[PDB]
Amino acid sequence: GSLTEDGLSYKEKFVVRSYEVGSNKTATVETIANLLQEVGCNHAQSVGFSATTTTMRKLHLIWVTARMHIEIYKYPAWGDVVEIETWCQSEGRIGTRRDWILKDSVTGEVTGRATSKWVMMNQDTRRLQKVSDDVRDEYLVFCPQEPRLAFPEENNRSLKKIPKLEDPAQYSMIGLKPRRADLDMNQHVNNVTYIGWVLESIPQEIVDTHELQVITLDYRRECQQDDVVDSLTTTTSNDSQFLHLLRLSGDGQEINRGTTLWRKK
Amino acid sequence: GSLTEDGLSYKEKFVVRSYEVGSNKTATVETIANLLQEVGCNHAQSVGFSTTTTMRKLHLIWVTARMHIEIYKYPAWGDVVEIETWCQSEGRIGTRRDWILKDSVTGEVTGRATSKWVMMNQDTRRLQKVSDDVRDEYLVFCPQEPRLAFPEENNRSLKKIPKLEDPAQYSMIGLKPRRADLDMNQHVNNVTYIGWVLESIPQEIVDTHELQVITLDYRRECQQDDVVDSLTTTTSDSQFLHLLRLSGDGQEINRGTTLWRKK
Ligand SMILES: CC(=O)NCCc1c[nH]c2ccc(F)cc12
Numbered sequence A: 001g002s003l004t005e006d007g008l009s010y011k012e013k014f015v016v017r018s019y020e021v022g023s024n025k026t027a028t029v030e031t032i033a034n035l036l037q038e039v040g041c042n043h044a045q046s047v048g049f050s051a052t053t054t055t056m057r058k059l060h061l062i063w064v065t066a067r068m069h070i071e072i073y074k075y076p077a078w079g080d081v082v083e084i085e086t087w088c089q090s091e092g093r094i095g096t097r098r099d100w101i102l103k104d105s106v107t108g109e110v111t112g113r114a115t116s117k118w119v120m121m122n123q124d125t126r127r128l129q130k131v132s133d134d135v136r137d138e139y140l141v142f143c144p145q146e147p148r149l150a151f152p153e154e155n156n157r158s159l160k161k162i163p164k165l166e167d168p169a170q171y172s173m174i175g176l177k178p179r180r181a182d183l184d185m186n187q188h189v190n191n192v193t194y195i196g197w198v199l200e201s202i203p204q205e206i207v208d209t210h211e212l213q214v215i216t217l218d219y220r221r222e223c224q225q226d227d228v229v230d231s232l233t234t235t236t237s238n239d240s241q242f243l244h245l246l247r248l249s250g251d252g253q254e255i256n257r258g259t260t261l262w263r264k265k
Numbered sequence B: 001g002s003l004t005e006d007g008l009s010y011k012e013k014f015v016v017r018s019y020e021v022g023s024n025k026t027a028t029v030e031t032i033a034n035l036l037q038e039v040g041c042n043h044a045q046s047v048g049f050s051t052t053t054t055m056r057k058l059h060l061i062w063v064t065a066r067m068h069i070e071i072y073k074y075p076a077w078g079d080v081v082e083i084e085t086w087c088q089s090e091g092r093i094g095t096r097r098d099w100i101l102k103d104s105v106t107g108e109v110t111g112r113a114t115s116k117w118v119m120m121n122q123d124t125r126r127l128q129k130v131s132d133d134v135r136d137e138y139l140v141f142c143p144q145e146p147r148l149a150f151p152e153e154n155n156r157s158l159k160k161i162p163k164l165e166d167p168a169q170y171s172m173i174g175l176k177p178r179r180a181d182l183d184m185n186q187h188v189n190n191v192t193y194i195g196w197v198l199e200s201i202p203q204e205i206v207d208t209h210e211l212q213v214i215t216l217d218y219r220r221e222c223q224q225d226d227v228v229d230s231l232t233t234t235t236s237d238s239q240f241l242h243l244l245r246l247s248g249d250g251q252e253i254n255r256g257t258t259l260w261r262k263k
């Protein structure tokens, strides 16, 4: 992987592995979600990070994901190479936004794209806060100054409001517990695990006859190792839409909400 | 990745990814187990496998009966690790696949693994322990002289694993596999069982020790609609005896041992 000529975006090529593919011999949405987070880690390392500034570490502040939107047109096949370009942008005092562009390494065609809204949170008290000026000055030198959106569209699905699933849910997957493989290098449940848990309540028939095109996922609270999650789904609709909800089985506290769009094969 | 000059073993270099490391910033044993599986797939593809020879006509597949993994140093996030794999004939009993993990910078052996593969009918699960006429179709891809990753006589890889007696010292119950735990054929992969075995190891042991050896005997496959129980007992460096069984019936699906060292 490497920074582009301007040093304002990062590119990386990944070869799809045997354990990264599903029933139709192509990369899963969780494998794609993993590749997006791996290229973000290398973009931070290349521009001089370990992605918190000296001021952020001093004040015990971290960047957390508030929304993850992923749209796929073609999933890379096992053995195929996929090139991912990522970049961050300042969204004023609200926070930052990280975008991605997935391309076929042979044809150069855009086979997918993603966007995410990141917020600033105190690592210790969990209290969110608007980006201060001194923090913004340290990041701006690594972001393009003119707007560069992966989802520019006049009426895009990345900025759509997600409602709360009303009970009873049409489908459900109960008693979901994270294992050590679901933890990251800091012993926290990986954000990609929530993607898997959301798709657990989608009926197997829908999976076997449809392909996942869009997935918007709003993050509300982190799930601890000793917590048990419930996955709820309802069909809100060749295209099929679903409303999703992840809540603690022990009290119904909401940890996640989302939508998925699927198309016929 | 590529076949060696003789075409009797395959080499591949992997860069350790951010999502592949644990709390100590190094690759997990499941990430290592995945890299071993990935290099075995590419070795099969390079020698002409779309894996399976005329066994396609007879409905026969290769299944893992034993997986033994020894690690001395786990690669760090960002480090490159070179893995060399090869298969060998173990008479009409079956086939044995070995691995050698090395540091790409120093060339030092940081780990090694071995596995016993058997032949099974994919439909009836009968398992034809014996094999004939099909050995010739593979022998041309195996070294003829013995090449063992674990040569030592009376070694940890060929040790008999006993059944954990009840009550177990530690336990992790109600384990269910998700879609990410399935392979390209919708079966629960042999790597998920490694994770489920280590689930019953206390968190305190994990935080103060590093996993050195892991021997795992496969007895029965776990379905998507099956629920597993992970049982552990300290048999002692720290050794443990492991057992994976179906939550209800107590039908054994796996058994093993893990050896851990102080940090
Ligand atoms: C993903 C994330 O932390 N985004 C907000 C911090 C940020 C702003 N501009 C960047 C450029 C490169 C980089 F690695 C991080 C940043």
Ligand SMILES: CC(=O)NCCc1c[nH]c2ccc(F)cc12
Pocket: B040, B043, B044, B045, B047, B051, B052, B062, B086, B087, B088, B095, B096, B097, B117, B138, B139, B141, B142
């Ligand atoms: C156990 C296992 O790996 N596969 C059984 C088939 C097999 C036997 N000898 C080989 C040599 C290279 C190769 F790619 C496959 C084989």
